[PDB]
Amino acid sequence: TFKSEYPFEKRKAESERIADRFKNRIPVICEKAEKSDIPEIDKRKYLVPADLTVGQFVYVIRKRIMLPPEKAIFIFVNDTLPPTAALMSAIYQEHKDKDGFLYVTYSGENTFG
Amino acid sequence: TFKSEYPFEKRKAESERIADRFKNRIPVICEKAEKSDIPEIDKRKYLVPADLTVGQFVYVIRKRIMLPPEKAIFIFVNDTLPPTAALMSAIYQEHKDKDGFLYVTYSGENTFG
Amino acid sequence: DPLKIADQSVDLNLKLMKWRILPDLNLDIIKNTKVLLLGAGTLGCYVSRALIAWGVRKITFVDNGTVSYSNPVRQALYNFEDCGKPKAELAAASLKRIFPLMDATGVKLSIPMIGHKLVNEEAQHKDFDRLRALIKEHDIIFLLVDSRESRWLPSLLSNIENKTVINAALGFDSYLVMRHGNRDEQSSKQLGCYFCHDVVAPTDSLTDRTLDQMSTVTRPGVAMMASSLAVELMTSLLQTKYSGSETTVLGDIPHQIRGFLHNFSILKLETPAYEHCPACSPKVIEAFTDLGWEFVKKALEHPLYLEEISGLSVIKQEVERLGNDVFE
Amino acid sequence: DPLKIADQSVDLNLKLMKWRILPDLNLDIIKNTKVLLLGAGTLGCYVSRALIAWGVRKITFVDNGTVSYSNPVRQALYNFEDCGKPKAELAAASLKRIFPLMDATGVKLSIPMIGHKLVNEEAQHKDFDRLRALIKEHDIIFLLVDSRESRWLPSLLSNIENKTVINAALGFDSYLVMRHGNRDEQSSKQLGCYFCHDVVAPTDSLTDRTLDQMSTVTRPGVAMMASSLAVELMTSLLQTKYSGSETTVLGDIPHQIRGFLHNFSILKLETPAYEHCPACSPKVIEAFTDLGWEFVKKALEHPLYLEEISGLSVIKQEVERLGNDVFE
Ligand SMILES: [Zn+2]
Ligand SMILES: [Zn+2]
């Protein structure tokens, strides 16, 4: 895990640095959900243009893990599934963590019956 | 409901009054859990000797609602089921509400198969 | 006679729920709801067992399959002696063996799957027409099939026919139970569907991926939890709402439920209908309204056509033009 | 032959869970667990369906009842044609009809109930002995009976024989699934049992309370949820724990689970063994150890005797002596 890498006081700083060194950018940590069947993604940190929608960010993730088109995922932010049309800025405002980063997980969608 | 009776600022006061006007006493609100099959209890407020155990308080409730011996209940404090041997003082310390009262609900125990 | 007694005994069990516990409960609405079950696998079987106990009288199974040797332990209307036989009609017969007054029917019908070549345009035209008619005939549609692409056409047709869809889907140790949104002519509010949560058109996920049996490799508990929640969602949904809330005499009516066995949890969630959704986007609805089967046949063979129509291609191109900085 | 294929197909389905998903999963431990089901009603039936799908080979039903006309819609091993017949042996036969390799047995055995007069001391002595032997013979005991008092004697005997008990119980729209604590010779820690949460000895709840049928007047969904969770709790519990946690390859092993349908929720809870518990108090254990059936027969006819032995009478007298101020 990332949040389990010991650096809380450092995180708030890394989050502040980003807030200044970059504009129109959302600091995001994106990781695979535990127990979910879906390819891993080692690169977990992202500076995301604030005007991108959730769906555009999902597209970025899909490409990063090289997921094939026939398989779908969904994302959780604070155990909620955000609207696909929402701006990452609005999501960041609502769900940003104490440490300044927005935490997201992704999981394979269920299909069996 | 009691907490829905509008008096937050008044509650903290009524809770302070009790803290001074009475010693070795725990201010408690005890109500029937929603949807639970169990006799109502109109008298919901209690000043409970701090040295009583949870089980002794359960006994008090049982008598108050005139429950017959053959039927059991359980209580929730903050969606937890406290140990029957615990002192009400220790429960109060751990679970007391912002407004100074300890909130408890009681429900009929499940028996069907 | 024994059958009359069965009828009166089940009826009384239900009446007592209203008389003794929830006087405002509407039992009749539940009894008279015509239910279409798309899928007669582990979900379809357990969902039907929960429905009959609630008093539902008409259940129609749609499944093109046969009973496999691994099925009976997980698919709770089939026995060892049934293996090799057509599932849907057996499931109907099994319901009547439980409670002989059931108006239970089974239909061996293939649902045309998006992303797959049309093998026989005419025969599948008929499958499409038959599916639309069954959907139109019933009141509540449970979508209990076994792939992503199998959920597309029924979702569209149910939206077109303005029917309530309850969609349930399983993974190894998790599950999803949700009700799809419907179109409101006056209200601009609409709830999401299964396809609103990602950004790819459904396509062929099957011709490629080996290990057929993995679609039933799940902790046995997940099918039972999902099935029971799907039915209780239906019974609550069928009740009238209290004035100032999203609740009924049976309690909540969540849009979407996701449960996980590893930590024994359940989340209640809600999402709005997504403008670029390849199933429920107004542009997709409009395309269907204009050309019907002539549009559907195009989308079936060309999933990318849906991405063009719904606007998914646009939002993705926009990410392509960003440049080398959503990376390091 | 067909039976060999059934055997290999179910076996493969299970193996794939380990090979492809959870390499550390112990399937053999689950397959070889001898399960005793006390109760063959809505819980016993659904629990057994979840067990066979997990590969469990030996299941023994204990139930003194017959199939009623209202049962088949809710009790998922029985059909309309079965009504009037003895439940336990029918349930066993029904499991074999699903999967013929099952070592499934049924026993029409009455469990002596605390608070009820002994009608025939000798015959019930034999019931007691038979129950203790079945408990001793099996590995995991599911307590799936239909009253408070029916849960007492099996809880005590299982603790005495050091067996794991999974206890499940239903209400109209809620349920309880828990594992009872066991005695540890060295550790002073022990988890609670069903009787640890209140302060009255179990007694006759039945001779009095009218409306027999209310014990099956429940939302159909609750039995399916409780049954599925009880089995998944068992499968996780049977796995080895990771070094620094209360978790296994299958995830959590909660002491106690309480679920509610009205708001689609599930709580994970934990309570310690209560010193005055009328089932698991060390004084009650000691009394059994000394006199066996000669103690039990006394407690059966005199529930208040348990309150004396366990100390419940003491704590209640203390409240009586308080004086008129735990009121207004
Ligand atoms: Zn949609
Ligand atoms: Zn106990």
Swiss-Prot record, chains A, B:
Q: Major place of localization?
A: membrane
Q: Where in the cell is it found?
A: Cytoplasmic vesicle, Cvt vesicle membrane; Cytoplasmic vesicle, Autophagosome membrane; Vacuole membrane; Mitochondrion membrane
- According to its record, how does it sit in the membrane? Lipid-anchor; Peripheral membrane protein
Description of post-translational modifications = This Gly-113 forms then a thioester bond with the 'Cys-507' of ATG7 (E1-like activating enzyme) before being transferred to the 'Cys-234' of ATG3 (the specific E2 conjugating enzyme), in order to be finally amidated with phosphatidylethanolamine. This lipid modification anchors ATG8 to membranes and can be reversed by ATG4, releasing soluble ATG8.
Which is one GO molecular function term here? protein tag activity
Instruction: Name its GO BP terms in alphabetical order.
Output: autophagosome assembly; autophagosome maturation; autophagy; autophagy of mitochondrion; cellular response to nitrogen starvation; cytoplasm to vacuole targeting by the Cvt pathway; endoplasmic reticulum to Golgi vesicle-mediated transport; lipid droplet formation
Effect noted on mutating L47A: Impairs ATG19-binding and autophagic activity
Query: Keywords in UniProt for this one?
Result: Autophagy, Cytoplasmic vesicle, Lipoprotein, Membrane, Mitochondrion, Protein transport, Transport, Ubl conjugation pathway, Vacuole
Which InterPro entries does this one have?
A: Atg8-like (IPR004241), Ubiquitin-like_domsf (IPR029071)
CDD domains noted in UniProt: Ubl_ATG8 (cd16128)
Q: GO CC annotations?
A: autophagosome; autophagosome membrane; Cvt vesicle membrane; cytoplasm; cytosol; fungal-type vacuole membrane; lipid droplet; mitochondrial membrane
Q: What upregulates this protein?
A: Up-regulated upon starvation conditions. Expression is under the control of UME6 which acts along with a histone deacetylase complex including SIN3 and RPD3 to negatively regulate ATG8 levels and subsequent autophagic activity.
Family stated for the protein in its record: Belongs to the ATG8 family.
Checking PANTHER family in the record gives: MICROTUBULE-ASSOCIATED PROTEINS 1A/1B LIGHT CHAIN 3-RELATED
Assembly information from the UniProt record: Conjugation to phosphatidylethanolamine (PE) leads to homodimerization. Interacts with ATG1. Interacts with ATG3. Interacts with ATG4. Interacts with ATG7. Interacts with ATG12. Interacts with ATG32. Interacts with ATG34. Interacts with ATG19 (via the C-terminal 10 residues). Interacts with the endoplasmic reticulum to Golgi v-SNARE protein BET1. Interacts with the vacuolar v-SNARE protein NYV1. Interacts with the UBX domain-containing protein SHP1. Interacts with the vacuolar membrane protein HFL1. Interacts with ATG45.
Additional comments on file?
A: Present with 2010 molecules/cell in log phase SD medium.
Q: Which protein are we looking at?
A: Autophagy-related protein 8
Q: Which organism is it from?
A: Saccharomyces cerevisiae (strain ATCC 204508 / S288c) (Baker's yeast)
Swiss-Prot record, chains C, D:
Where are the annotated segments for Homodimerization? 299-328
Does the record bear Transport in its keywords?
yes
* Quaternary structure, from the entry: Homodimer; homodimerization is required for ATP-binding. Also interacts with ATG3.
Result for mutant: E232R: Impaired homodimerization and ATP-binding
- Active-site residues? S215 (glycyl thioester intermediate)
At the top level of its lineage, which domain of life is listed? Answer: Eukaryota
Q: Which family does it belong to?
A: Belongs to the ATG7 family.
The organism is Saccharomyces cerevisiae (strain ATCC 204508 / S288c) (Baker's yeast)
Main localization is cytoplasm
**GO terms under biological process:** autophagosome assembly; autophagy; autophagy of mitochondrion; cellular response to nitrogen starvation; cytoplasm to vacuole targeting by the Cvt pathway; macroautophagy; mitophagy; nucleophagy
Record GO terms (molecular function): Atg12 activating enzyme activity; Atg8 activating enzyme activity; identical protein binding
> Motif GXGXXG motif located where?
39-44
State what protein this is by name: Ubiquitin-like modifier-activating enzyme ATG7
Q: Name one GO cellular component term.
A: extrinsic component of phagophore assembly site membrane
Consequence of changing D198A: Loss of interaction with ATG8
Describe the function of this protein: E1-like activating enzyme involved in the 2 ubiquitin-like systems required for cytoplasm to vacuole transport (Cvt) and autophagy. Activates ATG12 for its conjugation with ATG5 and ATG8 for its conjugation with phosphatidylethanolamine. Both systems are needed for the ATG8 association to Cvt vesicles and autophagosomes membranes. Autophagy is essential for maintenance of amino acid levels and protein synthesis under nitrogen starvation.
- Effect of altering Y194F? Loss of interaction with ATG8
Description of its domains: The C-terminal 40 residues are required for homodimerization, as well as the interactions with ATG3, ATG8 and ATG12; and the C-terminal 17 residues are required for the ATG8 lipidation.
Subcellular location(s): the record lists: Cytoplasm; Preautophagosomal structure
Q: Which UniProt keywords apply?
A: Autophagy, Cytoplasm, Protein transport, Transport, Ubl conjugation pathway
